[PDB]
Amino acid sequence: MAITSKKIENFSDWYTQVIVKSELIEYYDISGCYILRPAAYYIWECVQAFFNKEIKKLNVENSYFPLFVTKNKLESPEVAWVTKYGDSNLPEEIAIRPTSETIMYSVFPKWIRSYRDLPLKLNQWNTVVRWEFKQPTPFIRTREFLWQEGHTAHKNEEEAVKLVFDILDLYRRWYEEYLAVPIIKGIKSEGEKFGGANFTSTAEAFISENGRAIQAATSHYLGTNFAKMFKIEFEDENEVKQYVHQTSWGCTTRSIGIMIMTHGDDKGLVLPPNVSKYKVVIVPIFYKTTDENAIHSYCKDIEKILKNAQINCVYDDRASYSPGYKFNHWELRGIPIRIEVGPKDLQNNSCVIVRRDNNEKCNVKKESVLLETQQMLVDIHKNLFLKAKKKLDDSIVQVTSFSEVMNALNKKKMVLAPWCEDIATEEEIKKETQRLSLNQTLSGAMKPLCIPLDQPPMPPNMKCFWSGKPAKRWCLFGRSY
Amino acid sequence: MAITSKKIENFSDWYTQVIVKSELIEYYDISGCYILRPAAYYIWECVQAFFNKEIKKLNVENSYFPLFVTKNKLEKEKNHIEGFSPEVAWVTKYGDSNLPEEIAIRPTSETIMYSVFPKWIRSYRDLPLKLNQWNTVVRWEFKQPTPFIRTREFLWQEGHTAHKNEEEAVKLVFDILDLYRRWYEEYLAVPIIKGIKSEGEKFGGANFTSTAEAFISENGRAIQAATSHYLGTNFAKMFKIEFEDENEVKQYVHQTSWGCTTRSIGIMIMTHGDDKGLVLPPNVSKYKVVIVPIFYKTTDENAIHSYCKDIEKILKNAQINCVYDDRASYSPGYKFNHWELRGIPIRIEVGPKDLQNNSCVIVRRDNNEKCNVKKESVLLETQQMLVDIHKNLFLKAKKKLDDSIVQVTSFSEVMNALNKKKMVLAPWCEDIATEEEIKKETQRLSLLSGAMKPLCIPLDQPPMPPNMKCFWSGKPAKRWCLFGRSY
Ligand SMILES: Cc1cc(N2CC[C@@](CO)(C3CC3)C2=O)cc(C(=O)NCc2cc(F)cc(-c3cnn(C)c3)c2)n1
Numbered sequence: 001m002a003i004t005s006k007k008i009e010n011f012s013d014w015y016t017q018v019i020v021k022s023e024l025i026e027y028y029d030i031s032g033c034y035i036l037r038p039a040a041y042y043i044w045e046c047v048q049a050f051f052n053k054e055i056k057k058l059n060v061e062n063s064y065f066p067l068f069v070t071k072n073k074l075e076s077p078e079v080a081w082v083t084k085y086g087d088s089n090l091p092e093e094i095a096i097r098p099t100s101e102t103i104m105y106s107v108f109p110k111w112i113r114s115y116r117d118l119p120l121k122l123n124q125w126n127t128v129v130r131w132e133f134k135q136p137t138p139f140i141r142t143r144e145f146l147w148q149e150g151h152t153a154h155k156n157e158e159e160a161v162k163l164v165f166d167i168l169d170l171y172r173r174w175y176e177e178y179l180a181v182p183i184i185k186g187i188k189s190e191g192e193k194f195g196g197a198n199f200t201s202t203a204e205a206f207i208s209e210n211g212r213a214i215q216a217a218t219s220h221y222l223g224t225n226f227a228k229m230f231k232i233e234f235e236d237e238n239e240v241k242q243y244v245h246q247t248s249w250g251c252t253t254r255s256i257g258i259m260i261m262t263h264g265d266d267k268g269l270v271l272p273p274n275v276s277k278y279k280v281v282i283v284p285i286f287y288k289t290t291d292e293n294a295i296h297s298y299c300k301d302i303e304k305i306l307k308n309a310q311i312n313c314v315y316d317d318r319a320s321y322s323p324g325y326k327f328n329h330w331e332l333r334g335i336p337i338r339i340e341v342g343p344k345d346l347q348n349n350s351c352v353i354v355r356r357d358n359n360e361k362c363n364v365k366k367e368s369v370l371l372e373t374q375q376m377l378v379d380i381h382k383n384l385f386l387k388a389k390k391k392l393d394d395s396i397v398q399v400t401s402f403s404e405v406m407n408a409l410n411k412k413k414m415v416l417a418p419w420c421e422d423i424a425t426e427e428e429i430k431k432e433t434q435r436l437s438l439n440q441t442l443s444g445a446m447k448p449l450c451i452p453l454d455q456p457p458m459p460p461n462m463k464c465f466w467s468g469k470p471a472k473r474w475c476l477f478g479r480s481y
Numbered sequence: 482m483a484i485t486s487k488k489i490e491n492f493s494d495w496y497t498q499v500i501v502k503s504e505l506i507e508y509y510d511i512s513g514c515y516i517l518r519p520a521a522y523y524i525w526e527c528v529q530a531f532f533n534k535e536i537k538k539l540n541v542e543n544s545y546f547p548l549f550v551t552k553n554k555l556e557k558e559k560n561h562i563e564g565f566s567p568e569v570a571w572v573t574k575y576g577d578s579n580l581p582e583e584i585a586i587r588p589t590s591e592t593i594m595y596s597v598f599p600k601w602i603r604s605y606r607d608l609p610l611k612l613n614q615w616n617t618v619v620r621w622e623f624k625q626p627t628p629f630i631r632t633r634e635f636l637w638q639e640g641h642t643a644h645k646n647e648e649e650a651v652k653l654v655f656d657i658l659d660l661y662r663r664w665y666e667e668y669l670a671v672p673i674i675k676g677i678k679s680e681g682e683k684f685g686g687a688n689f690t691s692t693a694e695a696f697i698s699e700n701g702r703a704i705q706a707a708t709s710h711y712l713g714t715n716f717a718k719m720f721k722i723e724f725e726d727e728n729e730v731k732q733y734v735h736q737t738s739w740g741c742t743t744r745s746i747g748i749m750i751m752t753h754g755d756d757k758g759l760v761l762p763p764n765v766s767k768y769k770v771v772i773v774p775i776f777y778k779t780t781d782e783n784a785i786h787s788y789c790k791d792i793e794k795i796l797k798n799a800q801i802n803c804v805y806d807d808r809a810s811y812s813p814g815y816k817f818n819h820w821e822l823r824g825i826p827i828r829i830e831v832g833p834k835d836l837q838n839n840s841c842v843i844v845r846r847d848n849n850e851k852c853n854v855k856k857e858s859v860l861l862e863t864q865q866m867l868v869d870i871h872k873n874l875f876l877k878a879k880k881k882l883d884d885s886i887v888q889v890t891s892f893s894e895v896m897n898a899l900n901k902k903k904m905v906l907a908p909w910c911e912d913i914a915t916e917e918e919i920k921k922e923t924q925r926l927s928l929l930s931g932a933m934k935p936l937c938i939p940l941d942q943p944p945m946p947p948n949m950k951c952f953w954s955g956k957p958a959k960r961w962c963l964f965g966r967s968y
């Protein structure tokens with residue numbers, strides 16, 4: 001099979017082709033739900049192992065809360081409602097969790113009585129259902145998805161904010177160190193922040209081949225807002241009752257999606273080594289051999305070296321298929337490294353190592369196969385990240401006025417604009433960009449993506465690019481998913 | 482807090498007290514749904530790690546399939562529908578909107594996965610297909626629930642394979658069965674009986690169902706611990722999962738299915754828990770050791786603090802998780818009880834008298850046996866203790882299992898065995914019609930249901946005399962079968 005749509009030219013078709021033909025995703029007769037085949041679920045398992053290791057160092061503990069919330073306890077136009085079991089009607093409808101704030105925070109008071117019960121730090125690896133009737137995009141925007149949601153309660157605001165930003169850096173490492181994707185850290189505007197949050201912090205990603213931003217992960221400071229709604233109070237060290245200061249943070253399998261859209265090429269899936277089940281595929285070339293079993297033994301001992309070094313590989317000894325067919329088979333599926341061994345290189349005690357990301361063929365003696373493999377795996381990651389980073393940073397153009405924006409938006413860029421952050425302007429900007437875009441399947445609108453944590457200098461009397469009023473801060477704007 | 486009910490005299494109240502006060506579960510606003518607090522979810526995490534690494538050796542791969550299924554796919558089922566229909570949860574409203582196309586929450590994932598299996602299996606070159614899911618399922622039963630054991634929503638793994646013939650599939654069925662035995666014995670220290678299920682108790686649509694059964698001798702109740710089904714070609718015919726074999730002729734795949742749930746946690750709790758509360762196998766306790774200081778007005782409290790922090794660092798540099806209970810507001814005895822309630826396998830006490838000797842007291846949660854260890858060896862003895870505790874928990878458990886089986890030849894022996902909280906081993910003709918007769922008559926003579934059901938036909942069969950009759954019908958007995966009250 002082959003990718004018959006160029007990514008730069010027909011992005012959404014390239015994407016569906018890649019995710020189905022690499023065996024990541026299978027479509028399902030309920031739209032917005034997709035089957036995660038082994039190759040994608042493996043990526044999820046990897047980032048889950050990493051994130052678990054890292055949040056246990058923050059003393060977060062894993063737990064599992066129910067899938068169902070009662071109607072009253074959810075007081076939304078996006079929720080699947082259960083009503084019957086078999087043919088009998090439920091006494092009252094129950095909702096499938098779209099998020100678990102109201103499921104968890106209504107039992108938090110049974111656990112929190114005094115300052116000696118804090119901080120409470122829980123995490124869930126679960127599934128949520130968000131039944132939006134807009135159009136789905138696999139991984140990026142789906143009605144059922146896997147995620148992790150963490151929730152903490154602290155005795156004050158300093159501890160809670162510190163954790164919000166510790167989690168945000170763990171999300172940075174999740175994307176950069178495992179998915180080789182660079183992200184922009186920022187604060188969400190108050191029109192786009194989480195409902196009930198004090199502030200929402202965020203990591204944003206950008207798909208430059210189609211000009212779209214994607215929110216990669218979120219860490220919210222809820223403050224005492226949910227504490228006052230659910231009366232989560234505690235006796236402090238002065239016998240005074242106080243409200244807990246709360247955080248919640250989440251990340252979903254959308255991350256896999258962002259990864260595919262960043263590194264994928266026209267040959268197919270390109271996988272960062274850390275998240276590929278097979279890091280190496282060994283492909284024999286049997287033509288012109290003198291001892292087929294010698295080629296077998298040679299490949300199998302390369303295999304033994306690698307997995308004795310904890311490097312998982314597959315030996316593709318299928319006899320019917322040409323070497324070229326197998327090269328394409330494993331390239332499509334994103335295996336980062338291929339080892340070719342033909343009769344000349346058994347004669348030389350060498351083998352050819354091929355990097356998936358640049359297709360550079362390299363002749364290495366077998367004596368240093370492992371070392372070279374390990375080095376290349378590391379370098380593959382570096383290069384995937386670096387290529388992505390420059391692509392990200394060449395996608396942001398600073399503008400001082402709205403008149404420069406549409407042009408920048410039509411070259412598939414993000415605008416860094418000085419903004420007064422007044423909430424009424426978010427919708428005005430969205431509709432104006434929406435109407436101007438209506439002149440050549442997803443939305444033309446431009447929205448605040450985030451106020452970046454790393455700020456350029458604000459010149460003295462800088463006017464807001466939309467309002468003409470004093471500009472509060474620099475904000476990223478762009479089309480998104 | 483403490484356990485005020487004795488396991489042997491009020492089992493159900495003992496159980497609810499233990500699971501709540503050890504901070505294992507929390508009760509939820511919706512009946513039959515429970516919160517798994519960190520201590521129980523940790524056990525789930527451990528057995529999941531172990532099972533993942535074992536099934537990956539069998540070349541099973543993890544996957545994730547949707548939570549929902551249309552009626553179209555769920556009714557391709559011939560007898561699967563008979564088995565699961567009244568407990569299926571139905572989603573009818575979406576936001577603020579009822580749409581005709583109502584969808585069901587998975588009670589099990591056969592009809593979800595097998596509906597796409599034909600797309601992935603075309604040739605013998607595609608076989609075997611081996612998939613596993615860690616997920617949640619919903620079985621909304623009208624009967625009243627039991628935390629861990631019978632819940633309306635529960636966590637599990639479900640594994641599903643397809644093979645080119647019967648030999649491969651049956652071999653995998655029993656390899657998975659032994660992985661389940663290892664789950665229970667090596668991690669939960671719970672002995673199980675391997676067996677084959679009766680025809681009336683086997684999974685709907687399965688050719689045969691193999692099973693591990695556990696028994697709670699303190700209330701005479703059997704609990705099905707895990708199952709491994711050989712589905713043969715039943716689901717393959719009904720879902721048209723065919724493949725071209727080596728001669729280019731269509732065949733049906735031979736399928737297996739196997740599952741195990743958070744029920745195992747409950748089984749563990751019911752096996753080892755005692756009147757002091759939870760008793761955890763060390764493999765599934767987050768903390769292996771709790772250090773409690775003992776303060777007497779003879780020595781500096783800071784010297785004891787330093788000593789315990791030394792011990793804690795010794796243990797944590799050896800990858801043994803511990804906790805030093807430094808809390809100044811509570812007595813040592815309070816801490817003893819606090820941590821015995823929560824099932825920590827080992828407690829280390831240091832006071833003045835073992836600080837003077839560079840030693841400490843090591844106490845085992847399973848038998849309260851105390852040891853006096855010099856500091857320089859704490860580590861290794863702790864290590865050995867952790868192993869021995871596990872084996873003790875297993876061995877004790879096994880013998881209460883072996884003493885709980887009464888072998889009978891006549892129904893006249895049955896009630897006296899059931900009312901003495903045993904399961905019976907009885908010669909049985911295995912005709913499906915007799916299962917309901919037995920259930921009803923044992924319910925009617927008992928004072929949770931009093932019925933005894935067929936549990937398993939054990940793989941280990943005692944010899945069967947040539948003219949032995951079925952204990953219930955008088956017809957020639959075929960095999961020995963375990964009967965008991967259950968959950
Ligand atoms: C996979 C995924 C991840 C996240 N989220 C949430 C934010 C964040 C950022 O980190 C997070 C951790 C919590 C991200 O991961 C949100 C959705 C989602 O909203 N689903 C419902 C749905 C279904 C549908 F068919 C279509 C649309 C839809 C809406 N507009 N358009 C053009 C299409 C929406 N889905």
Ligand SMILES: Cc1cc(N2CC[C@@](CO)(C3CC3)C2=O)cc(C(=O)NCc2cc(F)cc(-c3cnn(C)c3)c2)n1
Nearest residue numbers: 620622624625626630631632635705706707708740742
């Ligand atoms: C945790 C769990 C595990 C398993 N399963 C099934 C077998 C096995 C072990 O082989 C497995 C698949 C792998 C086990 O784990 C089945 C249930 C369950 O049937 N839930 C519904 C329910 C809810 C309710 F409130 C009450 C009752 C009910 C029915 N009778 N009584 C007296 C009470 C049932 N629950």
Ligand code: PRO
Nearest residue numbers: 099149218248249250
């Ligand atoms: O949906 C969200 O953004 C928050 C964060 C994780 C849990 N709920």
Ligand code: PRO
Nearest residue numbers: 589639708738739740
């Ligand atoms: O419920 C059961 O018993 C089978 C085995 C796992 C999937 N379905």
Ligand SMILES: [Cl-]
Nearest residue numbers: 042045046049
């Ligand atoms: Cl892993």
Ligand SMILES: [Cl-]
Nearest residue numbers: 116117118119
């Ligand atoms: Cl705490």
Ligand SMILES: [Cl-]
Nearest residue numbers: 315316317318
């Ligand atoms: Cl292969």
Ligand SMILES: [Cl-]
Nearest residue numbers: 601602603607
């Ligand atoms: Cl195929």
Ligand SMILES: [Cl-]
Nearest residue numbers: 805806807808
């Ligand atoms: Cl403590």
Ligand SMILES: [Cl-]
Nearest residue numbers: 674886939941
């Ligand atoms: Cl037996």
